[PDB]
Amino acid sequence: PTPVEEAQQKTIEAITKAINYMAKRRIGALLTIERDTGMGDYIETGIPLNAKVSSELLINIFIPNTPLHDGAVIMKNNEIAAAACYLPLSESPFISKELGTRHRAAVGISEVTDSLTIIVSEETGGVSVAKNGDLHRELTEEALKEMLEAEFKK
Amino acid sequence: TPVEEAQQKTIEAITKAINYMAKRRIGALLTIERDTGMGDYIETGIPLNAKVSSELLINIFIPNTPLHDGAVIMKNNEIAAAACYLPLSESPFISKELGTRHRAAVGISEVTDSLTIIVSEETGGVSVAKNGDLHRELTEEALKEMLEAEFK
Ligand SMILES: CC(=O)Nc1nc(C)c(-c2csc(N)n2)s1
Ligand SMILES: CC(=O)Nc1nc(C)c(-c2csc(N)n2)s1
Ligand SMILES: [Cl-]
Ligand SMILES: [Cl-]
Ligand SMILES: [Cl-]
Ligand SMILES: [Cl-]
Ligand SMILES: [Cl-]
Ligand SMILES: [Cl-]
């Protein structure tokens, strides 16, 4: 385990801990992780943080009725770049009618970037992921961690 | 100058966040490093190294959240860490009207030249600890003058 590999693993654990905490509490969340496609244009629409990753900061951002909780958090490598960001809303006809704006935004950014977006439903606490225009819903924590590990490789 | 404009933006962010928390009576503890290094206390909290904004400061201190207990420590115009430990003053002149937040603020002000702002969770009153003294029930004008004196 090189320092970079360990850093990546700590970031993955930080994400999965935060998502699990919010899922249990029905705390709605929208977390977009930059991959190879730069997302500066969307990062600039939010509140700049440029912060180190922690599960604690991720949770604190999404607490309901707070300044930062609406909109997307966008992450870069080992960084929380900005919160309350705008994302394009998908027009896909495959987006279930019972889903929220968070899901429409996550699929939207996944259609025009190679990013990975995680969504926590404030209705059910269910966890979903948007990638390449596809939305995969009702993920177990095992499924989420394995997705992140597969996606962080490259 | 760019530095000066950055400083005033930081002061405005702090004062807007403190005003918000005072109105809601949200307890808060914010220490700003000056010439005495505070790395030993920064290391006790959660690393952030985050840009200052009123929004982030508010989100940190929301009650019953991971980051709300402990001190935020600011250094070099950034939020270095949250949920940090500070030394509790042993002064016999701190009123028992005041909380652990205030005793920690006075304590760090006894061993550093930092400026610490405290919002009371009971009254929303704003105080500042500097050089071992605690200045209570501050107006918005007095807090801004203190921060301007401190950043100059
Ligand atoms: C064109 C447009 O409207 N883009 C949006 N993006 C995001 C991330 C939004 C949002 C609103 S409330 C919430 N939790 N997330 S709206
Ligand atoms: C020895 C010791 O414990 N020092 C402390 N520092 C800080 C900043 C504290 C705090 C603020 S709010 C809360 N519940 N605790 S206790
Ligand atoms: Cl970019
Ligand atoms: Cl939702
Ligand atoms: Cl779901
Ligand atoms: Cl409170
Ligand atoms: Cl908590
Ligand atoms: Cl208090």
Author numbering:
A (entry chain B): 102 to 255
B (entry chain A): 103 to 254
Paper lines:
The enzyme CdaA, which synthesizes an essential second messenger cyclic di-AMP (c-di-AMP) in many pathogenic bacteria, has emerged as a promising candidate for the development of novel antibiotics. Additionally, c-di-AMP regulates the bacterial stringent response, further underscoring its significance. The synthesis of c-di-AMP is mediated by enzymes possessing a diadenylate-cyclase (DAC) domain.
Recently, we performed an in silico design of an L. monocytogenes CdaA inhibitor (Compound 7) that binds to LmCdaA in the micromolar range with a dissociation constant (Kd) approximately eight times lower than that of ATP. This bithiazole ring compound, which is distinct from adenosine, binds in the same position and thus serves as a promising lead compound for further optimization. The reported structure of BsCdaA in complex with an inhibitor (Compound 7) originally developed for LmCdaA, which reveals an identical ligand-binding mode, provides structural evidence supporting the efficacy of this approach.
